[PDB]
Amino acid sequence: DHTIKGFLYQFNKTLNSILSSTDQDEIQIEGIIEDIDIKNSNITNAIQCKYHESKVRHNLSDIYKPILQMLLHFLENDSLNIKYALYAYFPNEQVGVKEVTKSQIEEILSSSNFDYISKYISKIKPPKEQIIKELLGKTSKTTEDKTRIKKYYETSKLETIVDIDKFLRDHFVFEIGLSYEELMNETKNLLMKEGFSLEDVKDLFYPNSIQYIAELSILPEAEKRISSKNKLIDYLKGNKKTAMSRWTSEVLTRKQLLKVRKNQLVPSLNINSRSRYFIIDPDTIDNFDDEFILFVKDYLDKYNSKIKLHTETPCFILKTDVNNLSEYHKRFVSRNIQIITGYIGDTFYFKEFNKEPKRIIKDNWVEFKARISCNSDEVIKCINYKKCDDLYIVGGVDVSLLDTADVNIENLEINNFRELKYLLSMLKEI
Amino acid sequence: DHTIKGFLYQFNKTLNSILSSTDQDEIQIEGIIEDIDIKNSNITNAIQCKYHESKVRHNLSDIYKPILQMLLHFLENDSLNIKYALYAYFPNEQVGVKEVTKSQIEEILSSSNFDYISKYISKIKPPKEQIIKELLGKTSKTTEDKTRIKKYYETSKLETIVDIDKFLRDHFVFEIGLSYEELMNETKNLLMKEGFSLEDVKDLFYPNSIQYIAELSILPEAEKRISSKNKLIDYLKGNKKTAMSRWTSEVLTRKQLLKVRKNQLVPSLNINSRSRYFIIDPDTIDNFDDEFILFVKDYLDKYNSKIKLHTETPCFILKTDVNNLSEYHKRFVSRNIQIITGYIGDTFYFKEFNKEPKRIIKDNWVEFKARISCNSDEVIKCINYKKCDDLYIVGGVDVSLLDTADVNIENLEINNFRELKYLLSMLKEI
């Protein structure tokens, strides 16, 4: 449980650092250098997180390994402007910056642990004997070699390549961290400072942020582990908005949703000079063949009946073949409805599809009242040539080949023509 | 990162066990016996979680320590009806129950590692020499003692007190676990079967459950670590209900405030010959680039459509650069909306921006329908030269350099274009 608590403390510290950072700061969760790598414009901040709730008092030996690791990293990267921070919690130690003296650092380099000597002290303090260097270079070391290396490092005085004074002055800071409960309290307070309510932070924002930190921590790729305050804020806001919309919906009935959509649709339908394109999947509407002609007749009687006022010809695009289009053309001609399909035989003509109908107002005559064609590449190109102002999609037809830029797309979810007529304000009540 | 992934895998496994368990099953997260302690009416199930994604092939040595601990616990608790289960994941091992033979267990008891011999093998296989017993009883053991114990346990044949056959037959089972992604998917599908929608599980329920598991895993008290499916379900349902109620209330109060503001703004928007200037901060409106063109098109359809009645041209000022203005101008050109910017390349022109459009009522032609430009000094001087009846500010743009004497200023507080269309009486209901 202690390891889990320490990992959660590290995650909370990373979240606090992300919240407290600016929009220009790049922070790497489980970074290459340390647990938290905050990359500013010119200074890179490396933070090591340690949790010692079970330790009554802080001891120098408790932090031997992280100090040796960061000293080795500084030795390997002395030319880089990297500031190493050690964030360790101790119940009986005052929260704040704790100074580490040069004598304490020298005491760390004199530790009798063989693992530290072989891993970090050897590189920090190179051995002056070639035999010791060869022994340290061995991948597998026997007990006799370990004892020899330990005795040599305990008895021999070796110079330190790492500039302890300059590093302690400029590139190192040691801070006693807050308690884990105080850590979550401070993190939630920072979350509240972003405009989020306390209840929202407690229920949604804090667990989501913790899960996000945990998910980014396990990614093997270092680049994918880089996050920022703006990205986290946007992710949380998007999750909140999606949850709000989903929970606002799914409670009402079909009639109320249809009425809301109808009121959403009415204003664009109350205009007499609007070009409207319909893309329909016949398999999503019950009894399409029997009621397609009557639907078009009612639509033309409603929105394309005034010769002087209605100046735009509606377009109907269907997910069918050409033979069904010819059958629909026959059924339209038999009812004194003038349409153009663009197809002559089985070939599409570009100039026969985009021509504007001629109007003779005195005799109340329009050459053709609607464009009805199929879902083909040529028709899609023709539609893209002359963009519409409203684009209604019925049945979830694939619209990847259309130019959706700067066109008002309005998806309609229906399963019969009565609902379609209700949505388009051709019926008063279903 | 591997340890974090393993801990997350353990959390997912115990969450899956909690979801799959019945309402009468008491499950202890981070239990006394193993990671998962499922306590039924008569049988207690102990589950040990291991993650070995980095291991190509499963090896017997990979499970030496868990099996030895399991055998030691069985020896100490043979009278208790505890079924010990091992849950480890290997990428190249088929998911399912894997049998462990008695010969394999005997091989585990013959491991040469000193730690295992001193901790578990010594108790499982007591030494027949009193010297070895005294050495094992020492709290601190020197290297010579460790070597002596290792040699004695390697060379001496010791009987096994633990009933290996009975343990393997009744109290032991080894199962190859699923992958971390597969375990997450199975847990979500279990939450899918609980009536919680997939989006709800992804956004709220799963992160909340993971946070709850993590919080219960760190509790020092064993009793506080006992959880059940019903408690988690009730906690999730209560959180969802409270959040939905709060979000509904927030929506209601926001709509009331917006309705009050709309009714405030209605009287001035019904005049057909009023000059209106807009100052917009793009960063304060979500999806500004993808929706700016449509908003202006609808605004011109509502307020600049009547050639003989609508005589004033709107002016839109943005907090952008000239290049973005050129891009917007291109997009307006592509949509057949005539606008002027006053810019030729990078040079502003006072006379090009201050001119009035020409009108031909017979042809229903206007030279340009809107003025769109950035908030440069020259543009603001042009605005100051010709004062407007109504000045609208969106996003709190600094208007300190404008001469706002005897100018009606209407600050608008919005965060998307739907709210703006509501305020300007372009939509009937949000």
Short mmCIF file of N, CA and C in Angstrom, two decimals, chain A residues 327-410:
data_model
loop_
_atom_site.label_atom_id
_atom_site.label_comp_id
_atom_site.label_asym_id
_atom_site.label_seq_id
_atom_site.Cartn_x
_atom_site.Cartn_y
_atom_site.Cartn_z
N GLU A 327 -37.22 4.99 -62.98
CA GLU A 327 -38.57 4.67 -62.52
C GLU A 327 -39.20 5.84 -61.78
N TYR A 328 -38.43 6.49 -60.90
CA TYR A 328 -38.93 7.67 -60.20
C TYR A 328 -39.24 8.80 -61.19
N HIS A 329 -38.42 8.94 -62.23
CA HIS A 329 -38.68 9.95 -63.25
C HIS A 329 -40.00 9.68 -63.96
N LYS A 330 -40.26 8.41 -64.30
CA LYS A 330 -41.54 8.07 -64.92
C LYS A 330 -42.70 8.41 -64.00
N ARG A 331 -42.58 8.05 -62.71
CA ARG A 331 -43.67 8.31 -61.78
C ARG A 331 -43.87 9.80 -61.53
N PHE A 332 -42.80 10.59 -61.65
CA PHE A 332 -42.94 12.04 -61.51
C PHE A 332 -43.59 12.65 -62.74
N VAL A 333 -43.21 12.19 -63.93
CA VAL A 333 -43.80 12.73 -65.15
C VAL A 333 -45.28 12.37 -65.25
N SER A 334 -45.65 11.17 -64.77
CA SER A 334 -47.05 10.77 -64.81
C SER A 334 -47.94 11.64 -63.93
N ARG A 335 -47.36 12.41 -63.01
CA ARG A 335 -48.12 13.25 -62.09
C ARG A 335 -47.95 14.74 -62.39
N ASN A 336 -47.48 15.08 -63.59
CA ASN A 336 -47.29 16.47 -64.01
C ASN A 336 -46.35 17.22 -63.07
N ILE A 337 -45.22 16.60 -62.77
CA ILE A 337 -44.13 17.24 -62.03
C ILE A 337 -42.90 17.24 -62.91
N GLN A 338 -42.32 18.41 -63.12
CA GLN A 338 -41.18 18.58 -64.02
C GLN A 338 -39.89 18.55 -63.22
N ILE A 339 -39.05 17.54 -63.48
CA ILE A 339 -37.77 17.38 -62.81
C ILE A 339 -36.70 17.11 -63.86
N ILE A 340 -35.45 17.32 -63.46
CA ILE A 340 -34.29 16.97 -64.26
C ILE A 340 -33.39 16.05 -63.43
N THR A 341 -32.92 14.97 -64.05
CA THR A 341 -32.06 14.01 -63.38
C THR A 341 -30.61 14.09 -63.82
N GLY A 342 -30.32 14.77 -64.92
CA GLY A 342 -28.96 14.87 -65.41
C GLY A 342 -28.55 13.69 -66.27
N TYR A 343 -29.10 12.52 -65.97
CA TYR A 343 -28.77 11.31 -66.72
C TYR A 343 -29.60 11.23 -67.99
N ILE A 344 -28.95 10.92 -69.10
CA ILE A 344 -29.60 10.68 -70.38
C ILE A 344 -29.16 9.29 -70.82
N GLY A 345 -30.04 8.31 -70.69
CA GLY A 345 -29.66 6.93 -70.88
C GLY A 345 -29.01 6.38 -69.62
N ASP A 346 -27.69 6.24 -69.64
CA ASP A 346 -26.94 5.87 -68.45
C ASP A 346 -25.70 6.73 -68.26
N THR A 347 -25.64 7.91 -68.88
CA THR A 347 -24.50 8.80 -68.80
C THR A 347 -24.94 10.14 -68.22
N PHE A 348 -24.15 10.67 -67.29
CA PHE A 348 -24.44 11.93 -66.64
C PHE A 348 -23.86 13.09 -67.43
N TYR A 349 -24.62 14.18 -67.52
CA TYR A 349 -24.20 15.38 -68.24
C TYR A 349 -24.12 16.55 -67.27
N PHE A 350 -22.94 17.16 -67.20
CA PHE A 350 -22.69 18.23 -66.24
C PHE A 350 -23.52 19.47 -66.56
N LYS A 351 -23.63 19.83 -67.84
CA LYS A 351 -24.36 21.03 -68.23
C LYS A 351 -25.87 20.83 -68.21
N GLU A 352 -26.35 19.59 -68.20
CA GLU A 352 -27.78 19.31 -68.13
C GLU A 352 -28.29 19.24 -66.69
N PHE A 353 -27.42 19.43 -65.71
CA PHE A 353 -27.78 19.30 -64.30
C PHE A 353 -27.74 20.61 -63.53
N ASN A 354 -26.83 21.52 -63.87
CA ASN A 354 -26.68 22.77 -63.13
C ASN A 354 -27.33 23.96 -63.82
N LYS A 355 -28.07 23.75 -64.90
CA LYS A 355 -28.71 24.86 -65.58
C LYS A 355 -29.85 25.41 -64.74
N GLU A 356 -30.02 26.73 -64.76
CA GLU A 356 -31.10 27.34 -64.00
C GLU A 356 -32.39 27.31 -64.82
N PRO A 357 -33.52 26.96 -64.19
CA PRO A 357 -34.78 26.91 -64.93
C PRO A 357 -35.23 28.28 -65.39
N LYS A 358 -35.96 28.30 -66.50
CA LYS A 358 -36.51 29.53 -67.06
C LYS A 358 -37.90 29.79 -66.50
N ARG A 359 -38.20 31.06 -66.25
CA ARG A 359 -39.45 31.47 -65.64
C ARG A 359 -40.22 32.39 -66.57
N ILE A 360 -41.50 32.09 -66.77
CA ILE A 360 -42.42 32.97 -67.48
C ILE A 360 -43.52 33.31 -66.48
N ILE A 361 -43.42 34.49 -65.88
CA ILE A 361 -44.30 34.85 -64.76
C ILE A 361 -45.74 34.99 -65.22
N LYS A 362 -45.95 35.51 -66.44
CA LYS A 362 -47.30 35.78 -66.91
C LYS A 362 -48.14 34.51 -66.97
N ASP A 363 -47.57 33.42 -67.47
CA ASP A 363 -48.27 32.15 -67.54
C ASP A 363 -48.00 31.25 -66.34
N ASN A 364 -47.23 31.73 -65.35
CA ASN A 364 -46.94 30.98 -64.13
C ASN A 364 -46.31 29.63 -64.46
N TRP A 365 -45.17 29.69 -65.15
CA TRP A 365 -44.50 28.50 -65.65
C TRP A 365 -43.03 28.51 -65.25
N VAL A 366 -42.56 27.37 -64.74
CA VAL A 366 -41.15 27.15 -64.43
C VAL A 366 -40.72 25.87 -65.13
N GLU A 367 -39.55 25.91 -65.76
CA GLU A 367 -39.13 24.82 -66.64
C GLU A 367 -39.05 23.49 -65.90
N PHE A 368 -38.41 23.48 -64.74
CA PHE A 368 -38.39 22.29 -63.90
C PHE A 368 -38.37 22.72 -62.44
N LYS A 369 -39.02 21.93 -61.59
CA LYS A 369 -39.26 22.32 -60.21
C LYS A 369 -38.27 21.72 -59.22
N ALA A 370 -37.59 20.63 -59.57
CA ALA A 370 -36.67 19.99 -58.65
C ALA A 370 -35.59 19.24 -59.42
N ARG A 371 -34.45 19.05 -58.75
CA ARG A 371 -33.37 18.22 -59.25
C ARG A 371 -33.33 16.95 -58.41
N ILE A 372 -33.48 15.80 -59.07
CA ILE A 372 -33.46 14.51 -58.40
C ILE A 372 -32.47 13.61 -59.13
N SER A 373 -31.42 13.20 -58.44
CA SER A 373 -30.38 12.37 -59.04
C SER A 373 -29.94 11.33 -58.01
N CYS A 374 -28.83 10.66 -58.28
CA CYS A 374 -28.33 9.57 -57.46
C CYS A 374 -27.01 9.94 -56.80
N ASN A 375 -26.52 9.04 -55.96
CA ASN A 375 -25.27 9.24 -55.22
C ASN A 375 -24.12 8.71 -56.06
N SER A 376 -23.61 9.56 -56.95
CA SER A 376 -22.49 9.22 -57.81
C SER A 376 -21.45 10.33 -57.77
N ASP A 377 -20.24 10.00 -58.23
CA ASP A 377 -19.13 10.95 -58.15
C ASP A 377 -19.40 12.20 -58.96
N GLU A 378 -19.97 12.05 -60.16
CA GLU A 378 -20.26 13.20 -61.01
C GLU A 378 -21.26 14.13 -60.34
N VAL A 379 -22.29 13.56 -59.71
CA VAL A 379 -23.29 14.37 -59.02
C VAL A 379 -22.65 15.10 -57.84
N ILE A 380 -21.74 14.42 -57.13
CA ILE A 380 -21.06 15.06 -56.01
C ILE A 380 -20.22 16.24 -56.49
N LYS A 381 -19.52 16.07 -57.62
CA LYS A 381 -18.76 17.18 -58.18
C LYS A 381 -19.67 18.32 -58.60
N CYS A 382 -20.83 18.01 -59.18
CA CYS A 382 -21.78 19.06 -59.55
C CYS A 382 -22.26 19.82 -58.32
N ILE A 383 -22.56 19.11 -57.24
CA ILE A 383 -22.96 19.76 -56.00
C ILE A 383 -21.84 20.64 -55.46
N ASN A 384 -20.60 20.14 -55.52
CA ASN A 384 -19.47 20.92 -55.03
C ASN A 384 -19.23 22.17 -55.87
N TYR A 385 -19.57 22.12 -57.16
CA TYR A 385 -19.42 23.30 -58.01
C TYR A 385 -20.32 24.44 -57.54
N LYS A 386 -21.56 24.13 -57.19
CA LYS A 386 -22.54 25.13 -56.76
C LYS A 386 -22.96 24.79 -55.34
N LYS A 387 -22.25 25.35 -54.37
CA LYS A 387 -22.53 25.06 -52.97
C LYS A 387 -23.91 25.58 -52.57
N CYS A 388 -24.60 24.81 -51.75
CA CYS A 388 -25.91 25.19 -51.24
C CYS A 388 -25.74 26.01 -49.97
N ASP A 389 -26.86 26.50 -49.44
CA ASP A 389 -26.85 27.22 -48.18
C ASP A 389 -27.26 26.35 -47.00
N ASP A 390 -28.13 25.37 -47.23
CA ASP A 390 -28.50 24.37 -46.23
C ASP A 390 -28.32 22.99 -46.83
N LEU A 391 -27.78 22.06 -46.04
CA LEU A 391 -27.51 20.70 -46.50
C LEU A 391 -28.11 19.73 -45.48
N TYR A 392 -29.27 19.17 -45.82
CA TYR A 392 -29.96 18.22 -44.96
C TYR A 392 -29.54 16.80 -45.33
N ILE A 393 -29.12 16.03 -44.32
CA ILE A 393 -28.69 14.65 -44.51
C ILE A 393 -29.68 13.76 -43.77
N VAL A 394 -30.34 12.87 -44.52
CA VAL A 394 -31.33 11.96 -43.97
C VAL A 394 -30.83 10.54 -44.19
N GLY A 395 -30.68 9.79 -43.10
CA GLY A 395 -30.27 8.40 -43.16
C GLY A 395 -28.80 8.14 -42.91
N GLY A 396 -28.02 9.15 -42.56
CA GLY A 396 -26.61 8.96 -42.30
C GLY A 396 -25.81 8.54 -43.51
N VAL A 397 -26.05 9.19 -44.65
CA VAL A 397 -25.32 8.88 -45.87
C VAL A 397 -23.88 9.36 -45.75
N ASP A 398 -22.96 8.60 -46.33
CA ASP A 398 -21.56 9.01 -46.37
C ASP A 398 -21.42 10.31 -47.16
N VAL A 399 -20.87 11.33 -46.50
CA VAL A 399 -20.73 12.65 -47.11
C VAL A 399 -19.27 13.07 -47.10
N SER A 400 -18.37 12.09 -47.18
CA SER A 400 -16.94 12.39 -47.15
C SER A 400 -16.45 13.05 -48.43
N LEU A 401 -17.14 12.84 -49.55
CA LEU A 401 -16.72 13.40 -50.83
C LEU A 401 -17.27 14.80 -51.08
N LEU A 402 -18.11 15.32 -50.18
CA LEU A 402 -18.66 16.65 -50.33
C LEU A 402 -17.73 17.70 -49.74
N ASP A 403 -17.86 18.93 -50.24
CA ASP A 403 -17.14 20.07 -49.69
C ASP A 403 -18.00 20.66 -48.57
N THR A 404 -17.74 20.21 -47.35
CA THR A 404 -18.53 20.62 -46.19
C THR A 404 -18.10 21.97 -45.63
N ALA A 405 -17.08 22.60 -46.20
CA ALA A 405 -16.60 23.87 -45.69
C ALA A 405 -17.62 24.97 -45.97
N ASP A 406 -17.98 25.71 -44.91
CA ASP A 406 -18.84 26.90 -45.01
C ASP A 406 -20.21 26.58 -45.60
N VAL A 407 -20.75 25.40 -45.29
CA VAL A 407 -22.12 25.05 -45.64
C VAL A 407 -22.83 24.56 -44.38
N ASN A 408 -24.07 24.99 -44.20
CA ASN A 408 -24.83 24.69 -42.99
C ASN A 408 -25.36 23.26 -43.10
N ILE A 409 -24.66 22.32 -42.46
CA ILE A 409 -25.06 20.92 -42.45
C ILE A 409 -26.02 20.70 -41.29
N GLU A 410 -27.15 20.05 -41.57
CA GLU A 410 -28.19 19.82 -40.57
C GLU A 410 -28.66 18.37 -40.69
#
